[PDB]
Design a protein around this ligand. Structure first.
Ligand SMILES: O=C1CC[C@H](N2C(=O)c3ccc(N4CCOCC4)cc3C2=O)C(=O)N1
Ligand SMILES: [Zn+2]
Ligand SMILES: [Zn+2]
Lengths: 380, 801, 35
């Protein structure tokens, strides 16, 4: 776990996909619970969390035509959160707003490369197939339940003044947080619960605890690099957590940032190991190895030359992996590193890749990227 | 689908605002006090306070100012409510008839805007040229005080400083200048603006921007001939006026935050200040003539009063101290100190039952009429209050000088068990003052094998106090382990044991751990004047709540509900467990049904299965919102209190076709109470039309009562409410439906399933012609309803409390 | 020489190629993916 000389901003740019692409800055959002009708891409099957970037490649003519249509209008499509991959259960979904588009005619076939970003969660009201093979879905835009401060109702008018704290200092953190708890939740003496009980539901305190548990994954985790909004912070954390699909569905269902943060803290404090899906006992790694090599956190989604989307989690150590192939810089998701296939030792199933730096001055020299779909969390 | 009736057995007693002026007449010295929804107008006399009037407002008074625009012979009263109803009222007296006129009114809400961190601020220009309001960050609302602006039409002016901490209107300015202290990443600064009504905009302030103490909080607009302003913070008091700057850093004011103030002299030469620990100081402005200019600032510790929410100097050295945590006071400032060096001597004390954090109904005299024993107050103001209906509500006070948190009653031992907390400075800790836990007749300290610092650090010591029911003396005081926080308390029998025990749940709380990881369930027995620790159980979490469940113990440990049996060896054996994924803060029980509730309103309903020996999730209702209390009205209806001070009712409706509807608690009643309900308690205060009786205690010291009505009576009383709202003249012309509409924040829906008992009871206080107007084409049991039938119905309703 | 469209697997004969590709636990939308 050496100091990261690497420019962590590199992978988030998806340079591997290609050169600059038509970038659309036209953010589009729908009003709360506003009923909408949006298209669906059968190619995509990943659980998209709002704020997470999804890269894609599409070659089938129907998909190319659909994305061409989407470039006009809003550029927003839907990603269904398949509870059961078979028969496309899809009881919840996320709107993805295309923000990067490129077109190429290599191989003699029309190919479109896209980068979308999750924008809003929604409930699926009706899923119907069209004559062109593009499913069109009814969308109830789920709202963001924003609650006031816990003590906002119970607050002495005299103490309302001075509720704004001076600042955070650039033991010191512990003392400042003790003072913050003492001053913010003073009027907790007017109620039947203690101050720490209200701290357990405080947005800022929960974000601070999550940051404390994240810092183990990134020593250079400067606060500015993480969102300050509770909603954005909660979604970022949910996107960066190495958890199964059911837990991701659960986190998507929650509409309140406080509840999402509490569930995220629960998950972080519980999950310990990462084991093979095609097995049930071969542990590939542990939470302690998770380290962030990107501004998007340890785990992020990338594409292959054939368009498949892999949610790769970056770690500084892996075990039980059989290595196949040779270090190839081609289409490497991490610039300046060469990749190689990795399989589970027992079942010989694909788990991820091992990345090796191409320059001796580059740290970390080696690391691993393990696909989320090829791992499951294991509790002790 | 639910029918409930809510009455106020005791009106709110906490004071959140007081002003002095000439409201009733140009010659009278009036004191106006705001107690949440009540406005009390007294005439200050040499003999004390003479109550002149008391008015009920359809809102929580957030702002209350007196002003006398040119041409007026008396002060007008500007009032803003927590729902942003603004009104300018006048006092009119015709013979013996008193009525508060509504000179102007309106609603100053903005459809957009984040409510400010420091709450609503309301100020009036010294020349009464306008009213300045700070409700949302980045905006300053201006209401021109022109007599033609009868709708109080305001306009916003953008503020470049989002984090404004305080703001005032300056004196002696040709334009309505404002001086305000705000905060930004570079610290806290005092800045001045010059408001222009013609241009509806700010202009460059008179002096300049200036930097102030990092903890500057309070702004005082000194009158002429001084002018300028005084900024009061944690460690320093400074005076800014043009280029003139003055500062002092007295060490007396460094051990507590000064929160309230009041000008004593008309020329601003003296001010009263009050800290958070009940200390009352005097601030003196020494002036020297050159034009008069300030020479120095001196602060003196006048004395000690009840922890003051507001202060107001009436006359002849008399000061009214309005407090939220204790009884309000009328004290006198003496010229010379007494033998203990205190210049303050209390003349009168006005009862304040708030905050009510817990209560229990007990028939002490066993006459069939219950009495309500409440844990009221906080810190040195903490006490027990015994409230009983007289032959109108007699209240007895038992001071404790420490915070009482929970209370339960044990019939067999004829004593109350009270959980209490006292603050001790880590000196190794020492008590700040004598209190109930320290002066108990006999005492014990927890001694269990189970399980930095600073001089000024404060810690909480938690005690179980056994208090005699007759003398209310502290018979016993048992102190819990260090860092142990006592959260729950029940008194019950368990299993085949014929003894009655005090069972206490506690959590081991450390500042390092976010949530407790270990805790205790302790079983004491109070016998022959001794409190013996019968049993002790270690659990892996905080025991938030506990209830006797059909001879067993049902405890809530973190996010688990555990049922223990009381074996013959007198020890708790885990009978079963249930995992809910939410912290079971609220744990109520009725029959075999258990209601488990979380601070965010995540309610769920379990049923114990004796044959299977396990719990089953009967129903669930999760809805993000802050929740303060819950209760089980009957097998189906569950009553709770939630954010924006509103009651709600959930119904299970087990006779639902689809299993989805059998596992859903549909909300069937909403009602903006206007009070933050802290505790619910089954019981009644009258000797034993309506079914059931659930008293509830709130933060402002109000005690209310909720009962169940039949559909016919509910329909009749809803009709009566609609009839009355058209007849009764609300003060400030606030609509009753708007007042009682569910509120939250920018999300309001009409109240349903609740009959406003106070509005109905007011039917008896109107003139007979008004009664005839109210009763017209009404149907009563159908038949033609008459005034006397409704009088009889309302009289019957008035007897439940 | 044979490539796996999902991961960079390389193999010489064909039986192992099919074995691995089918081993991939997923719908393997070869219709929408292969050039
Ligand atoms: O970081 C990375 C590592 C893995 C990922 N990836 C694949 O899954 C994959 C599958 C087949 C591939 N071939 C296509 C035909 O000719 C060469 C072999 C290439 C890749 C590839 O780069 C990627 O694109 N970037
Ligand atoms: Zn395996
Ligand atoms: Zn493969």
């Amino acid at each position: 776990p050496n100091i990261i000389n690497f420019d962590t901003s590199l992978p988030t740019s998806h340079t591997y996909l290609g050169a600059d692409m038509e970038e659309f800055h036209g953010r589009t959002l729908h009003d709360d619970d506003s009923c909408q009708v949006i298209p669906v891409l059968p190619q995509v099957m990943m659980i998209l969390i709002p704020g997470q970037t999804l890269p894609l490649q599409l070659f089938h003519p129907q998909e190319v035509s659909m994305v061409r249509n989407l470039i006009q209008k809003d550029r927003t499509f839907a990603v269904l959160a398949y509870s059961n991959v078979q028969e496309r259960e899809a009881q919840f979904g996320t709107t993805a707003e295309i923000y990067a588009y490129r077109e190429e005619q290599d191989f003699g076939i029309e190919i479109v490369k896209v980068k979308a970003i999750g924008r809003q969660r929604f409930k699926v009201l009706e899923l119907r197939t069209q004559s062109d093979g593009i499913q069109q879905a009814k969308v109830q835009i789920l709202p963001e339940c924003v609650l006031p401060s816990t003590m906002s109702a119970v607050q002495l008018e005299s103490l309302n003044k001075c509720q704004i704290f001076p600042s955070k200092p650039v033991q010191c953190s512990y003392k400042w947080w003790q003072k913050y708890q003492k001053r913010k939740f003073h009027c907790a003496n007017l109620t039947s619960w203690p101050r720490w009980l209200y701290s357990l539901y405080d947005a800022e305190t929960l974000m601070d605890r999550i940051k404390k548990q994240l810092r183990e994954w990134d020593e250079n985790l400067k606060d500015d690099s993480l969102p300050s909004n509770p909603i954005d912070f909660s979604y970022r954390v949910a996107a960066c957590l190495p958890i199964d699909d059911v837990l991701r569905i659960q986190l998507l269902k929650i509409g309140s940032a406080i509840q999402r943060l509490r569930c995220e803290l629960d998950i972080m404090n519980k999950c310990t190991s990462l084991c093979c899906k095609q097995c049930q006992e071969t542990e590939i790694t542990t939470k302690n190895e998770i380290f962030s090599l990107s501004l998007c956190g340890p785990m992020a989604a990338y594409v292959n030359p054939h368009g498949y989307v892999h949610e790769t989690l970056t770690v500084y150590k892996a075990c039980n992996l059989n290595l196949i192939g040779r270090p190839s810089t081609e289409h490497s998701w991490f610039p300046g590193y060469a990749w190689t296939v990795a399989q589970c030792k027992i079942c010989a199933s694909h788990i991820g890749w091992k990345f090796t730096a191409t320059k001796k001055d580059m740290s970390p020299q080696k690391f691993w990227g393990l696909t989320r779909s090829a791992l499951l969390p294991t509790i002790p | 689908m639910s029918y409930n009736y809510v009455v106020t057995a005791q009106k709110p007693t906490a004071v959140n605002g007081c002003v002095t002026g000439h409201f009733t007449s140009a010659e009278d010295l009036n004191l106006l006090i705001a107690k949440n929804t009540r406005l009390e107008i007294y005439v200050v006399t040499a003999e004390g306070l003479r109550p002149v009037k008391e008015v009920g407002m359809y809102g929580k008074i957030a702002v209350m100012e007196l002003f006398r625009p040119k041409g007026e012979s008396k002060d007008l009263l500007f009032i803003l409510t927590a729902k942003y109803n603004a009104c300018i009222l006048e006092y009119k007296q015709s013979g013996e008839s008193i009525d508060i006129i509504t000179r102007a009114h309106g609603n100053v809400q903005d459809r957009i805007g984040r409510p400010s961190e420091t709450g609503i601020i309301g100020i009036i220009d010294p020349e009464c040229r306008m009213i300045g309001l700070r409700l949302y960050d980045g905006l300053f609302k201006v209401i021109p005080l022109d007599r033609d602006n009868k709708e109080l039409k305001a306009f916003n002016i953008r503020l470049e400083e989002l984090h404004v901490i305080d703001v005032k209107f300056l004196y002696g300015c040709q334009a309505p200048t404002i001086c305000f202290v705000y905060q930004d990443p570079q610290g806290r600064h005092v800045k001045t603006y010059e408001v222009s009504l013609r241009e509806k905009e700010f202009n460059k302030g008179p002096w300049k921007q200036e930097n102030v103490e990092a903890e500057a909080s309070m702004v005082i607009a000194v009158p002429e001939p001084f002018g300028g302003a005084i900024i009061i913070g944690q460690e320093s008091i400074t005076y800014h006026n043009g280029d003139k700057y003055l500062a002092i850093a007295p060490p007396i004011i460094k051990q507590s935050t000064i929160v309230c103030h009041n000008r004593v002299d008309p020329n601003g030469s003296r001010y009263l200040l009050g800290d958070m620990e009940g200390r009352l100081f005097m601030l003196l402005l020494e002036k020297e003539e050159q034009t008069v200019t300030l020479k120095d600032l001196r602060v003196e510790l006048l004395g000690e009063t009840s922890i003051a929410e507001c202060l107001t100097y009436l006359d002849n050295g008399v000061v009214f101290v309005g407090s939220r945590l204790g009884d309000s006071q009328l004290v006198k400032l003496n010229v010379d100190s007494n033998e203990q060096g205190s210049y303050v001597v209390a003349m009168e004390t006005f009862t304040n039952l708030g905050p009510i954090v817990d209560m229990c109904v007990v028939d002490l005299e066993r006459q069939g009429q219950g009495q309500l024993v409440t844990c009221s107050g906080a810190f040195k103001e903490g006490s027990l209050r015994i409230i009983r209906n007289g032959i109108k509500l007699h209240i007895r006070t038992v001071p404790l000088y420490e915070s009482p948190r929970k209370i339960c009653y044990q019939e067999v031992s004829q004593c109350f068990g009270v959980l209490s907390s006292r603050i001790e400075v880590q000196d190794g800790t020492t008590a700040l003052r004598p209190s109930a836990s320290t002066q108990a007749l006999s005492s014990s300290v927890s001694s269990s094998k189970l399980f930095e610092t600073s001089f000024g650090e404060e810690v909480e010591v938690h005690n179980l106090l056994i208090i005699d029911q007759h003398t209310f003396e502290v018979l016993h005081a048992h102190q819990f382990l260090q860092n142990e926080y006592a959260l729950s308390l029940v008194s019950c029998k368990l299993g085949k044991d014929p003894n009655t025990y005090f069972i206490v749940g506690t959590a081991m709380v450390y500042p390092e751990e976010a949530e407790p990881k270990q805790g205790r369930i302790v079983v004491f027995q109070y016998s022959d004047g001794k409190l013996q620790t019968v049993a002790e159980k270690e659990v892996k979490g905080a025991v938030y709540s506990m209830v006797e469940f059909n001879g067993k113990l049902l405890a809530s440990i973190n996010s688990t509900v555990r049922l223990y049996e009381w074996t013959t060896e007198k020890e708790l054996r885990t009978e079963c467990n249930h995992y809910n994924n939410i912290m079971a803060l609220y744990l109520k029980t009725k029959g075999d049904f258990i209601l488990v509730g979380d601070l965010m309103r995540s309610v769920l309903l379990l049923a114990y299965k004796p044959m299977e020996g396990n719990f089953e999730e009967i129903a669930r209702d999760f809805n993000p919102n802050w929740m303060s209390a819950v209760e089980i009205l009957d097998d189906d209806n569950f009553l709770g209190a939630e954010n924006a001070f509103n009651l709600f009712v959930c119904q299970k409706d087990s006779a639902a076709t689809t299993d989805e509807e059998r596992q859903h608690l549909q909300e069937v009643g909403l009602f903006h109470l206007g009070e933050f309900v802290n505790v619910f308690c089954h019981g009644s205060l009258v000797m034993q039309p309506t079914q059931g009786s659930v008293l509830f205690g709130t933060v402002n010291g109000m005690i209310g009562l909720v009962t169940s009505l039949s559909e016919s009576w509910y329909n009749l009383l809803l009709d009566m409410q609609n009839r009355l709202n058209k007849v009764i003249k609300s003060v400030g012309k606030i609509e009753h439906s708007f007042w009682r509409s569910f509120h939250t924040e920018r999300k309001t829906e009409p109240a349903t399933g609740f009959i406003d008992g106070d509005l109905i009871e007011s039917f008896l206080d109107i003139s007979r012609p008004k009664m005839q107007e109210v009763v017209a084409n009404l149907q009563y049991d159908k038949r033609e309803a008459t005034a006397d039938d409704l009088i009889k119905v309302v009289e019957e309703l008035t007897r439940i409390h | 020489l044979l490539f796996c469209p999902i991961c960079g697997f390389t193999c010489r004969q064909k039986g192992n190629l099919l074995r691995h590709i089918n081993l991939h636990t997923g719908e393997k939308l070869f219709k929408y993916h292969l050039y």
